[PDB]
Amino acid sequence: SMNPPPPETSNPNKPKRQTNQLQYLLRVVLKTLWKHQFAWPFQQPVDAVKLNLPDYYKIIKTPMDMGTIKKRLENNYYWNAQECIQDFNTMFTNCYIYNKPGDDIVLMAEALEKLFLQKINELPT
Ligand SMILES: COc1cc(C(=O)N2CCC(N3CCN(C)CC3)CC2)ccc1Nc1ncc2c(n1)N(C1CCCC1)c1ccccc1C(=O)N2C
Protein backbone atom coordinates (compact mmCIF):
# COMPACT_ATOMS: atom_id res chain seq x y z
CA SER A 1 0.00 0.00 0.00
CA MET A 2 0.72 3.71 -0.47
CA ASN A 3 0.95 6.18 2.39
CA PRO A 4 -2.26 8.07 3.19
CA PRO A 5 -2.39 11.78 2.42
CA PRO A 6 -1.10 13.84 5.37
CA PRO A 7 -3.55 15.59 7.71
CA GLU A 8 -5.04 18.76 6.28
CA THR A 9 -3.25 22.02 7.12
CA SER A 10 -5.90 24.28 5.63
CA ASN A 11 -9.62 23.93 5.06
CA PRO A 12 -11.69 26.56 3.24
CA ASN A 13 -14.83 25.61 5.21
CA LYS A 14 -13.30 25.92 8.69
CA PRO A 15 -13.35 29.38 10.34
CA LYS A 16 -9.98 30.45 11.59
CA ARG A 17 -8.39 33.06 13.83
CA GLN A 18 -5.25 34.10 15.69
CA THR A 19 -5.32 34.33 19.50
CA ASN A 20 -2.68 35.07 22.14
CA GLN A 21 -2.81 31.45 23.31
CA LEU A 22 -2.36 30.07 19.79
CA GLN A 23 0.54 32.50 19.22
CA TYR A 24 2.15 31.10 22.38
CA LEU A 25 1.63 27.53 21.15
CA LEU A 26 3.68 28.39 18.04
CA ARG A 27 6.32 30.79 19.37
CA VAL A 28 7.03 29.04 22.72
CA VAL A 29 5.56 25.52 22.90
CA LEU A 30 6.16 24.18 19.36
CA LYS A 31 9.49 26.02 19.08
CA THR A 32 10.78 24.49 22.32
CA LEU A 33 9.73 20.95 21.38
CA TRP A 34 10.99 21.29 17.79
CA LYS A 35 14.54 22.01 19.02
CA HIS A 36 14.68 19.11 21.48
CA GLN A 37 17.11 16.27 20.80
CA PHE A 38 14.17 13.81 20.56
CA ALA A 39 12.05 15.90 18.12
CA TRP A 40 13.22 14.36 14.85
CA PRO A 41 10.89 11.28 14.65
CA PHE A 42 7.96 13.62 15.19
CA GLN A 43 8.86 16.41 12.74
CA GLN A 44 6.97 14.82 9.79
CA PRO A 45 4.22 12.23 9.15
CA VAL A 46 5.15 8.57 9.60
CA ASP A 47 6.34 7.32 6.21
CA ALA A 48 5.12 3.76 6.61
CA VAL A 49 6.52 2.82 3.19
CA LYS A 50 10.12 3.86 3.89
CA LEU A 51 9.95 2.42 7.44
CA ASN A 52 8.47 -0.90 6.19
CA LEU A 53 5.43 -0.67 8.47
CA PRO A 54 2.55 -2.04 6.34
CA ASP A 55 0.30 -2.12 9.41
CA TYR A 56 0.98 1.36 10.82
CA TYR A 57 -2.05 2.95 9.13
CA LYS A 58 -4.17 -0.13 9.85
CA ILE A 59 -3.56 0.48 13.58
CA ILE A 60 -3.28 4.32 13.57
CA LYS A 61 -6.34 5.89 11.91
CA THR A 62 -5.85 9.39 13.39
CA PRO A 63 -2.21 10.23 12.54
CA MET A 64 -0.58 13.43 13.73
CA ASP A 65 2.93 14.90 13.84
CA MET A 66 4.63 18.19 14.72
CA GLY A 67 5.27 19.10 11.08
CA THR A 68 1.52 19.15 10.54
CA ILE A 69 0.99 21.08 13.80
CA LYS A 70 3.68 23.62 12.85
CA LYS A 71 1.96 24.21 9.48
CA ARG A 72 -1.50 24.41 11.06
CA LEU A 73 -0.22 27.08 13.47
CA GLU A 74 1.64 29.03 10.74
CA ASN A 75 -1.51 28.91 8.58
CA ASN A 76 -3.83 30.08 11.40
CA TYR A 77 -5.84 26.89 10.84
CA TYR A 78 -7.27 26.60 14.37
CA TRP A 79 -10.08 28.45 16.13
CA ASN A 80 -8.90 27.66 19.64
CA ALA A 81 -5.91 26.46 21.62
CA GLN A 82 -7.59 23.27 22.87
CA GLU A 83 -7.76 22.06 19.25
CA CYS A 84 -3.97 22.32 18.97
CA ILE A 85 -3.35 20.76 22.39
CA GLN A 86 -5.47 17.84 21.16
CA ASP A 87 -3.23 17.44 18.10
CA PHE A 88 -0.13 17.08 20.35
CA ASN A 89 -1.97 14.56 22.55
CA THR A 90 -3.05 12.57 19.49
CA MET A 91 0.57 12.41 18.34
CA PHE A 92 1.78 11.11 21.72
CA THR A 93 -1.07 8.62 22.12
CA ASN A 94 -0.44 7.20 18.64
CA CYS A 95 3.16 6.43 19.64
CA TYR A 96 1.95 4.68 22.81
CA ILE A 97 -0.66 2.62 20.87
CA TYR A 98 1.60 1.28 18.11
CA ASN A 99 4.66 0.67 20.33
CA LYS A 100 5.08 -0.98 23.74
CA PRO A 101 5.91 0.41 27.20
CA GLY A 102 9.60 1.13 27.65
CA ASP A 103 10.41 1.08 23.92
CA ASP A 104 13.04 3.63 22.84
CA ILE A 105 10.56 5.76 20.89
CA VAL A 106 8.02 5.66 23.73
CA LEU A 107 10.64 7.03 26.17
CA MET A 108 11.35 9.77 23.59
CA ALA A 109 7.65 10.68 23.31
CA GLU A 110 7.27 10.61 27.12
CA ALA A 111 10.12 13.12 27.49
CA LEU A 112 8.59 15.43 24.86
CA GLU A 113 5.18 15.11 26.52
CA LYS A 114 6.60 16.09 29.94
CA LEU A 115 8.19 19.19 28.40
CA PHE A 116 5.02 19.98 26.45
CA LEU A 117 2.96 20.05 29.64
CA GLN A 118 5.58 22.23 31.39
CA LYS A 119 5.43 24.78 28.56
CA ILE A 120 1.62 24.81 28.56
CA ASN A 121 1.67 25.37 32.35
CA GLU A 122 4.00 28.37 31.86
CA LEU A 123 1.53 30.27 29.63
CA PRO A 124 1.30 33.70 31.37
CA THR A 125 -2.04 35.22 32.33
C1 LIG B 1 12.90 10.87 8.67
O2 LIG B 1 12.26 9.93 9.52
C3 LIG B 1 12.97 8.94 10.13
C4 LIG B 1 14.35 8.82 9.97
C5 LIG B 1 15.04 7.80 10.62
C6 LIG B 1 16.53 7.69 10.43
O7 LIG B 1 17.02 6.61 10.15
N8 LIG B 1 17.29 8.78 10.56
C9 LIG B 1 18.72 8.77 10.25
C10 LIG B 1 19.46 9.21 11.51
C11 LIG B 1 19.01 10.58 11.97
N12 LIG B 1 19.70 10.95 13.22
C13 LIG B 1 21.11 11.26 12.93
C14 LIG B 1 21.84 11.60 14.23
N15 LIG B 1 21.20 12.76 14.87
C16 LIG B 1 21.88 13.04 16.14
C17 LIG B 1 19.78 12.47 15.14
C18 LIG B 1 19.07 12.12 13.83
C19 LIG B 1 17.51 10.51 12.22
C20 LIG B 1 16.75 10.07 10.97
C21 LIG B 1 14.35 6.89 11.42
C22 LIG B 1 12.97 6.96 11.61
C23 LIG B 1 12.25 7.97 10.99
N24 LIG B 1 10.91 8.13 11.10
C25 LIG B 1 10.16 7.80 12.18
N26 LIG B 1 9.09 8.55 12.50
C27 LIG B 1 8.30 8.27 13.54
C28 LIG B 1 8.56 7.17 14.34
C29 LIG B 1 9.76 6.36 13.98
N30 LIG B 1 10.48 6.71 12.91
N31 LIG B 1 10.15 5.21 14.65
C32 LIG B 1 11.53 5.00 15.07
C33 LIG B 1 11.59 4.10 16.29
C34 LIG B 1 12.81 4.58 17.08
C35 LIG B 1 13.19 5.96 16.54
C36 LIG B 1 12.17 6.31 15.46
C37 LIG B 1 9.19 4.20 14.72
C38 LIG B 1 9.54 2.96 14.21
C39 LIG B 1 8.62 1.92 14.21
C40 LIG B 1 7.33 2.11 14.70
C41 LIG B 1 6.94 3.34 15.20
C42 LIG B 1 7.81 4.42 15.22
C43 LIG B 1 7.30 5.71 15.79
O44 LIG B 1 6.43 5.61 16.64
N45 LIG B 1 7.72 6.92 15.43
C46 LIG B 1 7.30 8.11 16.15
Nearest-angstrom CA–CA distance, 77 and 83: 10
| Domain interval for residue 24 | 19-123
Could you tell me if residue 14 is inside a domain? no
Could you tell me if residue 13 is inside a domain? no
Q: Could you tell me the resolution of this structure in angstroms?
A: 1.6
Compute the 3-state secondary structure of the chain and give helix, strand, coil in percent, each to the nearest 5. Answer: 55, 0, 45
Secondary structure letter of residue 79 according to DSSP: S
Could you tell me if residue 58 is inside a domain? yes
User: What three-state secondary structure class fits 1?
Assistant: coil
Element (H, E) at 114: helix 104-121
Q: Is 123 in the pocket of ligand 1 (CB under 6 A)?
A: no
Could you tell me if residue 4 is inside a domain? no
Q: C-alpha distances in angstroms, 41 versus 17, 37, 80?
A: 29, 10, 26
Could you tell me if residue 44 is inside a domain? yes
Counting the structural domains of the chain, the total is 1
* CATH, residue 117: 1.20.920.10
What residue's CA is closest to ligand 1, atom 1? 41
Method: X-ray
Could you tell me if residue 89 is inside a domain? yes
Ligand 1 binding pocket mutation candidate from 46, 58, 99 (most atoms within 8 A of CB): 46
